[PDB]
Amino acid sequence: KNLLRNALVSHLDGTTPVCEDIGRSLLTYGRRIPLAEWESRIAEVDARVVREVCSKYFYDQCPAVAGFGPIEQLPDYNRIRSGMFWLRF
Amino acid sequence: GRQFGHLTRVRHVITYSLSPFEQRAFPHYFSKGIPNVLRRTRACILRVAPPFVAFYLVYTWGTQEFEKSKRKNPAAYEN
Numbered sequence: 001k002n003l004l005r006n007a008l009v010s011h012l013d014g015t016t017p018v019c020e021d022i023g024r025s026l027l028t029y030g031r032r033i034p035l036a037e038w039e040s041r042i043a044e045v046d047a048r049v050v051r052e053v054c055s056k057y058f059y060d061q062c063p064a065v066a067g068f069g070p071i072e073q074l075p076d077y078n079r080i081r082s083g084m085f086w087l088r089f
Numbered sequence: 090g091r092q093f094g095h096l097t098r099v100r101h102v103i104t105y106s107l108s109p110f111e112q113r114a115f116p117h118y119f120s121k122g123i124p125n126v127l128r129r130t131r132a133c134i135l136r137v138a139p140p141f142v143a144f145y146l147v148y149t150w151g152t153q154e155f156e157k158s159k160r161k162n163p164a165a166y167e168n
Contacts, residue, residue, distance in 0.1 A: 062108040073094035077106055 001042050008038055060085040 012018050012035070025032050061084055067074045075083075 062110050072096060072099070073092075077108065081108060081110075 001045060004042055005039070008035065058084065 012021060022032060063080060063084060065074075065077065065080060
């Protein structure tokens with residue numbers, strides 16, 4: 001959480017990054033979303049939220065894999081796919 | 090033994106692939122498979138099949154001679 005707070009604030013430092021943020025936020029969210037709202041969102045996150053939210057997008061999900069280079073040892077897709085779930089769970 | 094990462098050198102080949110949960114396990118099982126087996130059959134009959142009919146022919150003849158020669162036989166002993 002703290003890492004996100006520092007990142008959020010560290011980023012919006014100076015006219016250019018803030019401008020880019022105003023400009024594109026309006027494109028995406030439609031509004032600006034003031035620091036404080038982000039803060040409340042972040043505050044709401046606890047272990048449970050991480051577990052659930054992660055499970056939803058990650059758990060037993062088919063990934064997209066891209067590889068370039070000396071990739072003979074890159075695991076087979078089935079093998080990568082089996083790493084997306086845990087047999088003890 | 091040998092390990093992935095130390096087998097051999099390969100340059101320039103791209104492999105595209107799908108997740109099993111995204112594809113069918115039997116697509117055109119019959120539509121494409123039957124034709125395929127007919128084709129592999131044609132490709133090998135001339136080499137596989139002949140020696141076996143050769144055995145088959147010797148199998149039927151061989152037993153035929155056996156029966157007619159010994160048992161069935163007692164042919165002529167005429168007086």
